[PDB]
Amino acid sequence: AISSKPLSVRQIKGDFLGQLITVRGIITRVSDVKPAVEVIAYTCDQCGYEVFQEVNSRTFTPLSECTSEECSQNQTKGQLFMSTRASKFSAFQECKIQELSQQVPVGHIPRSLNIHVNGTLVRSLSPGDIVDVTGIFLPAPYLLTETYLEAQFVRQHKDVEERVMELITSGDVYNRLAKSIAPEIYGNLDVKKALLLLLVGGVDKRKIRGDINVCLMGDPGVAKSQLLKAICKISPRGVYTTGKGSSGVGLTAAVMKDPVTDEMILEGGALVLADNGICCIDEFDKMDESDRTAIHEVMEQQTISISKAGINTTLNARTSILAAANPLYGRYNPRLSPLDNINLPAALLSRFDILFLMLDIPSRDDDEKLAEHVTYVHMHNKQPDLDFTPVE
Amino acid sequence: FAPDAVFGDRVRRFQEFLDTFTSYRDSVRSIQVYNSNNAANYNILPHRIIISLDDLREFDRSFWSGILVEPAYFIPPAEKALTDLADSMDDHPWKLSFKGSFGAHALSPRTLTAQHLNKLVSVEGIVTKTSLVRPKLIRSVHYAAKTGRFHYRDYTDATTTLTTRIPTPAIYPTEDTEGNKLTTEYGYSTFIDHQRITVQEMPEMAPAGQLPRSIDVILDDDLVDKTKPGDRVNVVGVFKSLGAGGMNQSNSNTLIGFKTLILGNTVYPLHARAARQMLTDFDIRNINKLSKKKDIFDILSQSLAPSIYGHDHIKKAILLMLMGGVEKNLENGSHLRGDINILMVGDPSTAKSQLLRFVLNTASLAIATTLTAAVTTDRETGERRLEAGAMVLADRGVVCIDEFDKMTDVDRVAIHEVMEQQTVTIAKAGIHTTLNARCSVIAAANPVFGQYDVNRDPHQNIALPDSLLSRFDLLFVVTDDINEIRDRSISEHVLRTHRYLPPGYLEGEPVRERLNLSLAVGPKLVTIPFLRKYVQYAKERVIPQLTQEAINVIVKNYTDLRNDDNTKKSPITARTLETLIRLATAHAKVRLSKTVNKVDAKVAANLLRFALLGE
């Protein structure tokens, strides 16, 4: 029964070596596939009788003299040459699994393990996967042995064109689908109705530029960040960012190393992941000059540019923008132009298809309407309003 | 003398010792039957016994001093006698461990000296540089392809044995004497866990103008991961030299000393100089009897931090955070956060940090800080690992953040995800994922320059943005009031503290640093355990439902706050409304009440109005 139990990585002790255990964790890194020799085939130059060496370790030493009876009986010291055509290779790949961040005891470093996977089971894993893996827990030559898990079986943790008619036949689907966008958020149905059109999109023709963009602006709060996150959930090919957030690969692209090792690579930011899709910029007012010129290049070329380390290149970034320009100094002055309240230049704002300024006005009547909605959602736990027909 | 001759006498003498003190035999059988029962129905205890050096002294002083001074000759026969005893019990090597009265062999990494080599020693210290656990090969088993026999080989190094034996150099044999090829058998082959830990001297003991010394303990199998970095520990083991020490002819420089170690026999963490509590019928009765009284929200909160002058509303708010609000997953699993977050702005020297101590020692699953999650790397890692910050570690727990004004930009930018989404997102090295960080936070902060200016906002006295400060449900400002009654009280407490004279010291005698190693011979306010048991019982027994009369008080108070002059102090908004719902729910959890009702909202709104507006 022991193979059935999913062990966390730090429960894998030395006594398990040789057993077909099952482990649980997150894959923090994955190798590119490379071939490994099962059997080397050598041709013999002076007799043509091939010979074979099987390999059963991380290293080997190649053969030199023809050991075959064809040469050996003739005492003919022929020379051996490796053939990749005739050698049997197997696909090899390595992945580093780490215990889940929740499993780490208080103060300990998260423990990790090498998984080796061979044959057709290769490229069943990817970084960020949370997964259960069966394998043989094994030593390797470094008395302290190196150790790894030989993977054997994997459990990842994670018609339509007829089925659309079920909603079409019910009618008024635009109004209802817009009302299905974040039903837990009060009112603002005209804004939701526009935000839906950004997912649906216009025409691109030849060029004619087809993406649709909206800026929300004005006082902080009013469930706006949740609305942007909800759009990222609802929409296909969506991504959520902030003007300073997503601070790893970033919203703005660059050439990069993997400084944990020594190689270099070019990789895209969020605006490339949002390609053929939609990007949501929270804290939009706070993004820097490189970020602003990045969204400029989305709107002006539908690309993001590279000009570094001898590489000049533009990466494709066809994408809708949803944006949230919350003002300076904590609150908008609700009778002024936005440029007296917002950091961003009006040039950038002019490229958006629509801009919605919304103010968090204290007004007893609208306060009670909003508060009745919020308190009802908290009280009832279901159907954030009636007759909205919230589609999943 | 040749040890092998007297080995039998030492075995039978330790067997007589084991018979004389039968509690060791009883412990051996207790371990065996526990392991048998865990095997019987699909946890395992180790083959280790802690023997008292006092018992062994009273039995045979000559054998006892042999164990202390010559463990390389006296431990192996004693462990052989123990193994024979365990084998004599009905249906693998057993190990010894030691406790008590080491005398001159009670040491620290400073006073551990070359005179002590190969003696049994106890070292008082602090753990640093815990290595990764590695499996160490000690027996390799091999099926012979044609011969049929299972050949094997045992292995030796300077750490696996208490006495010197020729090292066996880490090679698997692959051929029989007859030349037949061998296939190595994992599982049947035996590997022991192996770990190195660097015990540092306690810095309190280190004398004037000296760095703390340190030494490497070696730990095998069931002693591995007994401790983590920073643990104050007492280790017992044999102090040893190893290696060639530059006597080997490669080394022109022979001034280098020999490497030295302790081979560990036991690891005692010194936690003392309940995370989930037991509950007796007395506790069940008195918890429920107390819950029917009205002033519990005063008495329980005032039982927090009883040394603190004033700050009743702060203690009440702390109690509501400890009994925080209920989670709301709506339809489609749409998540809204029930947890509560608090921030104590103010002067230094106020109650803040001491309140964080009292909260930290009262709460459970509580993390001390002075964040989020990260992708990280270190000196020896040729690899990157995903790390948990305090909020991830406090998932469904609490975080205590002192000096929160000091936190750096990459942290503060990502705190928004904790505050809005109760989660944190990773965005580099292809680990694009999101982690649960569903905690209730209490933070404290100081002015960045000068004393706190009570006219200026928290956004102005401290560099933290208003768009960050506004995330917290409750935002207190505390200040060092110069009240003579308070000052008289705390002054006399501090004077009584500084008049303390330790036991048996003469008047004016200086306190000696020698202490802990020299003694290394091994108004109805409630108790904090009772308060813990009450909050545990509340979390254990109720999830209050939200009644409409509560809603009517809540919308009344929110729309009042959002249209009274309180608007001129703060732009009161939707976050304040859901905060009122959380705080009223928390007060229902104070009551243990099956529902939230109008009474809870009336308390919560008074506290929130005080916290934000001071009234």
Next chain:
DNA sequence: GGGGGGGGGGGGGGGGGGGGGTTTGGGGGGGGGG
């Protein structure tokens, strides 16, 4: 007068022995705040 056998030189194989295999400070460039 040619072929076998004896004796000496030269080359190749096999064995044995031996050696090698990250922190701290400083200047200059580049960007941001008063």
Next chain:
DNA sequence: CCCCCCCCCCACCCCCCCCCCCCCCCCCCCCCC
């Protein structure tokens, strides 16, 4: 517009190899048929 900050960049076993020794083979010379 000017100055300060902060960021970057840089300093014991096993294999290959070589040396030494011994045997075997091949050629030359002399004798026998």
